[PDB]
């Protein structure tokens, strides 16, 4: 009533004050500033490998940290570990539930994590004395499906779920240590900072939030999209990120200045982005649209400089190695592809 | 080739065995019939499972050397469009509606009742873009309570524009035609209907017939003869 009205009014005043103080710090767009350097030449990328063996739609993939091994997950119910240089298969892991949406691969190479549409995140151990891959742990405690999961180190994992909640877990105990709350709708994606002390998340209320792993508090809020947020990623510097909407638009948000930097869209694109990624020097922004092909934007001038057209269904996942050698794309036709 | 050493000619063999096991395990998942079950809460879903019993919930049974597998999504209550494209290649959708409950109104809101909310849900799931060629089996549940409930209250509370004598068969026909009308394709979709009840034992034959029909038409479509 009275207290509710006063709280709502003061919150609106603070929102207006935040918007004004964000408006005051802008003098020149990044476009005016970058009107000097010459454009990169048209990027001619061609397919080198093609990795086949999945019998259904592919939903996620993740590059290893030695830049030679990757993992992929499909609705078939299997999780496969490949070997890009020779195309061979190292491991094929059966699953107890085939409704997967997320896979992640440890930054040391011992564990993999999987999950989706079951409310449960599973941790598998790859290096055992018995010769097989066995399920190591089963983290339960969410209420909606699992949208993303990332390893923070070998014994700490952060997940995001479709009940407006992210959680940080100790794997050995099995229990949440911190819960991250404050969004309105389903949380769709998260990305970790290069130092792994911050991470951003993006949800279906057209907003993105900058958290804090230590203290478990939301520190900043970024808005401006007009629809869902399907993908997000940090700049290799760790001081900006790029958001991939569902209204056929990408955006670049700045951390220290907390303001929108530029917009990546074109008048022939009317279908939403399903994945974004960066280049090792932070110049090329790769975006995977669902008109069946990827697009390569020059991140300092917002100009297309190539097209990776080799798929015949929706592109669902996309990623660049840690040394910037190749890019991999997956798709709903059950094929992975690798580009130099 | 000859570029390979004695420890790169064993990784290739291991990969080939992985491949044959994957391909052999993809055959056992192509000779099962997958059904997606849907309903409006207190609408006989559990009872239908009981006649057919052996987050996501699973049922897995057998009938006449055919093997059915049934997915129940009641306890999700998330945003629907972010996971409804997962059930894209299901053979059929089993929709359970309760016609013995037309009078009672929503617990959340005394204004709107069971029937119109269920009709809206059916409309949403029928004209979806992922299910433009997936069939819908429609179970009308609890036909005992309808018999004893129709005598007191005329259905003009739920259907003001209907002219009837408030008897069983004409009201049941009116309900089924009102449900089958919401279909907007009429060409690449059919909506079967069956009046169920507690103590039936006959609610597996109907599903078997409907899925045999769907499979026959899929086969005709594949060879182009259709």
């Amino acid at each position: 009533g009275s207290e509710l009205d006063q709280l709502r009014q003061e919150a609106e005043q603070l929102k207006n004050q935040i918007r004004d103080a964000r408006k005051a710090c802008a003098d020149a767009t990044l476009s005016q500033i970058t009107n000097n350097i010459d454009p990169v030449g048209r990027i001619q990328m061609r397919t080198r490998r093609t990795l086949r063996g999945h019998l259904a739609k592919i939903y996620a993939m993740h590059w290893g940290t030695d830049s030679r091994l990757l993992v992929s997950a499909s609705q078939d119910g299997k999780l496969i570990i490949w070997d890009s240089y020779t195309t061979n298969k190292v491991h094929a892991i059966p699953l107890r539930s085939s409704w997967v949406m997320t896979c992640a691969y440890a930054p040391s190479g011992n564990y993999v994590a999987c999950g989706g549409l079951d409310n449960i995140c599973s941790i598998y151990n790859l290096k055992t004395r018995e010769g097989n891959v066995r399920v190591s742990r089963e983290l339960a405690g969410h209420t909606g499906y699992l949208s993303c999961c990332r390893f923070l180190d070998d014994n700490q994992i952060v997940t995001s779920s479709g009940d407006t909640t992210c959680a940080l877990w100790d794997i050995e105990t099995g229990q949440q240590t911190t819960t991250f709350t404050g969004h309105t709708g389903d949380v769709m994606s998260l990305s970790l900072a290069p130092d792994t002390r911050l991470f951003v998340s993006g949800a279906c209320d057209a907003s993105a939030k900058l958290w804090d792993v230590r203290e478990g508090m939301c520190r900043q809020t970024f808005t401006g999209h007009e629809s869902d947020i399907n993908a997000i990623c940090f700049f290799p510097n760790g001081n900006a990120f790029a958001t991939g909407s569902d209204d056929a638009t990408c955006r670049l948000f700045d951390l220290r200045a907390d303001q929108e930097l530029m917009t990546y869209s074109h008048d022939n694109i009317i279908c939403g982005i399903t994945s974004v990624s960066f280049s090792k020097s932070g110049r090329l922004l790769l975006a995977g649209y669902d008109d069946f092909n990827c697009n390569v934007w020059d991140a300092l001038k917002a100009d297309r400089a190539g097209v990776l057209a080799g798929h015949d269904n929706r592109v669902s996942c996309l990623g660049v190695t840690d040394d910037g050698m190749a890019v991999a794309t997956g798709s709903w036709d059950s094929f992975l592809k690798i580009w130099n | 080739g000859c570029t390979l050493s004695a420890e790169d000619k064993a990784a290739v063999e291991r990969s080939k065995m992985i491949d044959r096991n994957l391909r052999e395990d993809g055959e056992k998942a192509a000779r099962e019939v997958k059904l997606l079950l849907l309903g409006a809460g207190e609408s006989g879903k559990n009872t239908i499972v009981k006649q057919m019993k052996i987050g996501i919930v699973e049922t897995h049974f057998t009938f006449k050397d055919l093997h059915f597998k049934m997915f129940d999504v009641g306890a999700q209550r998330s945003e629907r469009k972010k996971w409804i494209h997962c059930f894209e290649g299901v053979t059929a959708i089993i929709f359970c509606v309760a016609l013995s409950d037309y009078d009672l109104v929503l617990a959340e809101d005394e204004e709107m009742n069971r029937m119109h909310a269920s009709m809206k849900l059916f409309d949403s799931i029928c004209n979806n873009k992922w299910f433009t060629d997936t069939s819908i089996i429609l179970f009308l549940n609890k036909k005992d309570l309808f018999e004893e409930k129709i005598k007191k209250s005329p259905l003009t509370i739920c259907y003001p524009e209907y002219a009837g004598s408030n008897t069983y068969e004409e009201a049941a026909a009116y309900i089924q035609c009102q449900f089958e009308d919401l279909n907007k394709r009429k060409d690449t979709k059919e909506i079967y209907t069956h009046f169920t009840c507690s103590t039936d034992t006959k609610n597996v034959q109907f599903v078997f017939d409907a899925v045999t029909d769907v499979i026959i038409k899929n086969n005709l479509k594949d060879c182009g003869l259709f």
């Epitope: 491991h91 018995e130 010769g131 | 050493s5 004695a6 420890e7 990784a11």
Partner: single-chain antibody, 232 residues
Framework: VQLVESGGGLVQPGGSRKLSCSAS????????MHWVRQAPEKGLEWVAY????????YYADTVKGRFTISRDDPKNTLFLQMTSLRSEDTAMYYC??????????????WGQGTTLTVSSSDIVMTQATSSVPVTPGESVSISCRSS???????????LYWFLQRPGQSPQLLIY???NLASGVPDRFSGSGSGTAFTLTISRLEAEDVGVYYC?????????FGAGTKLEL
Amino acid sequence: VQLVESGGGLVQPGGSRKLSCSASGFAFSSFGMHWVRQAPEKGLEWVAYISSGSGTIYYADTVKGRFTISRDDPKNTLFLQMTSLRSEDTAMYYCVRSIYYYGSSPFDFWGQGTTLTVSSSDIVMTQATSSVPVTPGESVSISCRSSKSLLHSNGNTYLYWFLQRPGQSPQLLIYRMSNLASGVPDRFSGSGSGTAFTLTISRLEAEDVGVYYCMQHLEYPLTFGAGTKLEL
């Protein structure tokens, strides 16, 4: 994890016999398996190999046409059948696990051994020294040399160092050139180039006393360097 084989005994020069190993503890159906022999007061040499899935079988030129290797995969028991027993076939037989994929470590676990007495080209690896007296606390270096290059085009060089203590079966120490085996102290290190290789022990204790072997894995047959002992 364990491998227990049996079948040994004393047999006449004209005869045939069988050896069988029982494999309890691991996934026996995804592990290639070797048989390796060691003569009485002499080094040890490779005998046979059977793949995972019984696809490929390799033998030794000295033994081809007399030995048959087979599995029993449901029951986890692997057999070697010997049809002619010359008087120089007396040895002690070991059965060896090995798994190949990217990042593996073949020759991990090394059975327990079964004696057998009998009544009465190839890459050459050489170890120059035969005995190295030493005292605890000081480093030791052991040398292996080959007759041609082990550095393949792909980038790997297939050299293995492993140890045998008295009254005990051997165990992997180092794989490839510098990779350290599972559960060994970090005191051991190894390196080399081309056709020369050296193993170094920085510290020293009373458990390092024993014999050391260097082996190659470019092509079958697999050959073993002679035995070098290290005394206290």
